[PDB]
Amino acid sequence: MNLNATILGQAIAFVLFVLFAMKYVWPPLMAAIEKRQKEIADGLASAERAHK
Amino acid sequence: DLDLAKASATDQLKKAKAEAQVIIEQANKRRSQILDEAKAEAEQERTKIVAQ
């Protein structure tokens, strides 16, 4: 409709929310998820070695 | 379950290490018996012939 300077005022708010999410939100959560995954799978490895 | 596996493996390896030593000690005992009885017969038969 009205193409407006807001087209810029949004992009700023965009690139910020991407970076703080990247550096300070995602690794903290995925590290815990992968930790629980690996440390559940290690038990399966232990059972396999017990049988072996 | 893995701490049961370690116990069982160590116990059975100890059993087998006892068994091997027992078997080879009795093998040396048999060797001594054979050699000493051979030494005895080596004189029994010689005395027999030299009296004949």
Side-chain angles (χ1 to χ4, degrees), chain A, chain B residues 1-2 4-5 7-10 12-13 16 18-20 22-24 26-52:
Chain A
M1 298 168 50
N2 183 235
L3 273 160
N4 184 285
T6 302
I7 195 170
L8 181 67
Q10 179 70 10
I12 305 307
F14 183 30
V15 72
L16 301 193
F17 296 143
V18 167
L19 295 177
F20 287 3
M22 181 215 288
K23 306 196 82 176
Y24 304 131
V25 176
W26 181 271
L29 294 161
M30 272 304 298
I33 290 164
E34 289 294 342
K35 186 164 61 190
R36 175 165 45 235
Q37 294 299 156
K38 165 178 155 56
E39 299 176 1
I40 283 170
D42 58 353
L44 321 182
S46 278
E48 177 267 21
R49 265 215 291 94
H51 214 310
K52 272 214 151 214
Chain B
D1 295 6
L2 181 64
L4 302 196
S8 59
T10 51
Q12 289 182 13
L13 261 289
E19 303 330 309
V22 169
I23 289 166
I24 293 190
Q26 295 213 126
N28 283 270
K29 203 174 300 301
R30 274 269 277 147
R31 200 225 283 97
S32 72
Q33 170 183 357
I34 291 164
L35 290 178
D36 75 13
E37 86 184 343
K39 202 74 61 165
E41 289 181 308
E43 298 310 321
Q44 180 265 5
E45 180 259 18
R46 187 185 65 73
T47 55
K48 179 180 73 183
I49 285 177
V50 302
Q52 161 187 336

